[PDB]
Amino acid sequence: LADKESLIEALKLALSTEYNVKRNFTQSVEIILTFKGIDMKKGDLKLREIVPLPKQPSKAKRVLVVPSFEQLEYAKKASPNVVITREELQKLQGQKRPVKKLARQNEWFLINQESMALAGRILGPALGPRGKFPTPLPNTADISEYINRFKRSVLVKTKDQPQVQVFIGTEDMKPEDLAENAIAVLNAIENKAKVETNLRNIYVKTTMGKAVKVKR
Amino acid sequence: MKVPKVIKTYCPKCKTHTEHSVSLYKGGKRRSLAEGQRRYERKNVGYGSKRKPEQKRFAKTTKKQTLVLKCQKCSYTIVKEGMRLKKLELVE
RNA sequence: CCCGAACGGAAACAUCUUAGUAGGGGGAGGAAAAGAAAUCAAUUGAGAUCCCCUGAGUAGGGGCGACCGAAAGGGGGACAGC
RNA sequence: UACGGGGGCUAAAUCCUGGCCACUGGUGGUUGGUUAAAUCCGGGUUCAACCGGGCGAAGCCCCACCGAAGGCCGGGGGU
RNA sequence: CCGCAGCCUGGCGUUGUCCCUCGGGCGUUUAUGCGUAGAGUAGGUGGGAGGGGUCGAACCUGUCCUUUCGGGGGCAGGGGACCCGAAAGUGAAACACCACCCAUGGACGCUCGAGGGACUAACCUCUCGAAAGAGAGGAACAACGUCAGGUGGGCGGUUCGGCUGGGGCGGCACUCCCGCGAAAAGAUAACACGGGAGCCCAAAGGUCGGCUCAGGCGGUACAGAACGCCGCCGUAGAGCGCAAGGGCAAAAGCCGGCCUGACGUGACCCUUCCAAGUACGGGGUCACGACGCGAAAGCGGGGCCUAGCGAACGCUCGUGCCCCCA
RNA sequence: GCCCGGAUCCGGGCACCA
């Protein structure tokens, strides 16, 4: 629940030094959630959605995808951080930290529909409270367009708290572009429920900023 | 007496036999602002004796057990006539 | 104009009815009191108060029991206004 | 104005007035539970009625004392 | 069974001035965190393998506070500059920095209360004064008004069932079911006799198939009157939830398979209740709609039949619509 | 029907006009 021009004003604080500090590296914008009056039992905080962000920040995230022999030469064009083949993913048996490390830093762990039943026995217990959901991929030849959906998408999940800390953007877009980065998130939460009453204050800061104010 | 949790009977809205979920009847809250509660309170203002008769002699020991059946496709509910029993063990 | 029962009936009886009656206290007159819409009713109408025939045992109140109970409107009598 | 006013029981004098505080009653106390109206908070209602929550006195639950307070003063088994 | 006084206690009013403390909140302010596996304090969700580095680091030596003295958190100097892993473990890892949460304490401005203390001018008590007025003591309590809870035969209104070899005590022949009384149609009384019900069962209900029970006889290790097996007889001498009476054998009993007709709506008839009025309750026969079981005709709105149950008003639930005003 | 405490049941104090 925010105004049309509020997001541009929200990014104006983030981009400008009035609510940001310019260090040796480019800043990244993040949002933290602060709400009031939500309980786990009532069964409304089932936030497990994805957002197709049209604007792509220059800094790509750790996105992991597991293709098959059908499209072994299609997923390499999207420049993923780390990719493991279906034919050799079963080799992780016994290993625990390599299972943990390259599943929480990475945004997603996409696995094909053929190995869907195998996507809950190895990464199941290892990502129980962590909250990783493998999204099945289309069985067509083209996968980069599907990966492009997940290059800058964020996996949101909550279990016992009403807040999620997620990536939304950086310092490298237009001041009005955050109105397109956050609109997918705003539309997604709009189209699944309506808990705008529980809101108290929305903090849209940078990586190294402080609490800001969003008009509401 | 034991009764199943699910029973297949006639759904009169669907006009065929469907599955139903079985539960025991329980009444609601008395809801002040009911017309007979507005009248009772209007009668208790002022001076006088106890205004209304109140039961004192009781003979029955059980109560009629009523079954509530909800049609699992359309949520239509049929309520059955009660029957004097101890406590209907509704466990499947 | 204020204060204010019980007997009886409900086939018992306490809410109820009897009844604002009986009774008590205060204040007048040849009559008193009321009286000139912060009223009624309904497609934009009537036009101060009082009394009679009605509306009508209707609306409505009630251990929804025994029982209790209007007003507007219609027809008349007089019909002023400051 | 306590050597008093008020309220009980017994019934001159002599010799005495035993055991029991479980019940009822009276008095006092309290970790604690419950506890009305009013006020306060949340929901609801373009406002209310209406739903909840908190706070919650005396009393009651709980503890102790009192028989010249009402009173009560058995049975069974063995040596 | 109920009321009403009196009494006790709390809110509001009369009712005012100064404080202090505490507990809530609102916009801020901040610094503090060991179930186990391990370089070791993983409390959790993410950006984030880079973050700090004359844009002054890792390291010895002490003052100091603290803790399950585990151990971390802050001090300047001596050091003029270094460490975490992308690497090893964890149902959940990076003291790589930054955010919110659970959770400790304090402070700013505002609000709300709750408690304690003081004061005097309301109010009260006394004294002097013919009055007017003056003085002393208490004091925002008491007292009074109003509302709320408790206590309350102090006082008022009432109710104190019936049948019945008089009434009482007893019993219930006070609602319902079976036999007999009862006189071979129907009806028929006794504080007559012999007894029961106020429920139990998801099967002890529906259907289809197979089978035959109690008891006795002959032959078999333990084997016995009574275990299993092989034969002969057996009109019921068994079983059918529960009283009594009736009914039942390729079953109405016993053992299995599949099921939920213990079904939605709407009628008529019998009995209670003879001919001859009459509430409930119970039962029987069906129509429409839909099922179950059977090859099928068909059987099935509970239990083999006769007991196991309750008006108006009020509340509540189910189910589709109707109404709310000069 | 409540609160609360105790092992769905029990106890205590209040709710409850067919």
UniProtKB/Swiss-Prot annotation, chain A:
Keywords: Repressor, Ribonucleoprotein, Ribosomal protein, RNA-binding, rRNA-binding, Translation regulation, tRNA-binding. GO terms for cellular component: large ribosomal subunit. InterPro entries: Ribosomal_uL1, Ribosomal_uL1-like, Ribosomal_uL1/biogenesis, Ribosomal_uL1_3-a/b-sand, Ribosomal_uL1_arc, Ribosomal_uL1_CS. It comes from the Archaea. CDD domains: Ribosomal_L1. The keyword RNA-binding applies. PROSITE patterns: RIBOSOMAL_L1. GO terms for biological process: regulation of translation; translation. GO terms for molecular function: rRNA binding; structural constituent of ribosome; tRNA binding. Belongs to the universal ribosomal protein uL1 family. Probably involved in E site tRNA release. Binds directly to 23S rRNA. HAMAP family: Ribosomal_uL1_A (MF_01318_A). This is Large ribosomal subunit protein uL1.
